[PDB]
Write a protein that binds this ligand. Structure first.
Ligand SMILES: *CC(=O)N1[C@@H](c2ccc(C(=O)OC)cc2)c2[nH]c3ccccc3c2C[C@@H]1C(=O)OC
Length: 163
C-alpha cells in the first residue's frame, strides 16, 4: 500500500458487505471520513456532510464514510445498526463497513492516506479522534486533511479548487 499512487487502487467493503472497487470514484472529488454514532460531534458532522452532498453531488462531490470504534468506543454497533443510524440523518452518500484506521490492522486505504504529503495533519499522521476528514481530488490523490474539531462546512473553502 505504501507505493500505491491513488485512492483508486484500493477496495473496501460497503456497509451492506459488498466489496467496492474505489476506482469508481475516478473523476470525482471525495471526502473520506471516519464516523461514529456516539460522539459529541456526531450530529454536526452527519448533518453538515449531508448538506455538502446535497449541494455538491451535481458537481461531482462524493462522500465515503468509514465507521470506526477506536475512539472512545463510540461506534459499538453492528454494520446493520450503523446503516439505519445514518438513514436517520437522510444520508445519501456512501456508507462502508466498520474498520480500524490506526494500527497494524488499519484498512490499507487509511494507512496510505495518512502518509500522503497532504495527509499528514497539523498534529501528525495518526487519526486522533472520530470525524477526521480527507479531501481527495479527481485523480484519487489526497489534497487536504481536516481534524476532528473542524466542522465539515470548513471544507467549502477548498472544494471549488478541485471540482
Ligand atoms: C458544480 C457546479 O455547478 N459548480 C458551480 C455552480 C454553478 C451553479 C450552481 C447553482 O445553480 O446553484 C444551485 C451551483 C454551483 C460553482 N460556482 C461557484 C462560485 C463560487 C464558489 C464555488 C462555486 C461552484 C461549485 C461548482 C464548480 O464549478 O466549482 C469549480
Amino acid at each position: 500500500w505504501r507505493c500505491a499512487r491513488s485512492m483508486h487502487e484500493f477496495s473496501a467493503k460497503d456497509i451492506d458487505g459488498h466489496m467496492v472497487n474505489l476506482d469508481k470514484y475516478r473523476g470525482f472529488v471525495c471526502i473520506v471520513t471516519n464516523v461514529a454514532s456516539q460522539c459529541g460531534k456526531t450530529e454536526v458532522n452527519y448533518t453538515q456532510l449531508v448538506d455538502l452532498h446535497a449541494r455538491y453531488a451535481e458537481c461531482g462531490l462524493r462522500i465515503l464514510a468509514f465507521p470506526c470504534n477506536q475512539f472512545g468506543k463510540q461506534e459499538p454497533g453492528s454494520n446493520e445498526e450503523i446503516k439505519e443510524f445514518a438513514a436517520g440523518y437522510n444520508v445519501k452518500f456512501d456508507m462502508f463497513s466498520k474498520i480500524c484506521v490506526n494500527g497494524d490492522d488499519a484498512h490499507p486505504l487509511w494507512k496510505w492516506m495518512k502518509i500522503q504529503p497532504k495527509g499528514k495533519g497539523i498534529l501528525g499522521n495518526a487519526i486522533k479522534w472520530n470525524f477526521t476528514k480527507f479531501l481527495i481530488d479527481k485523480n484519487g490523490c489526497v489534497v487536504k486533511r481536516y481534524g476532528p474539531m473542524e466542522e465539515p462546512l470548513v471544507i467549502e473553502k477548498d472544494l471549488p479548487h478541485y471540482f
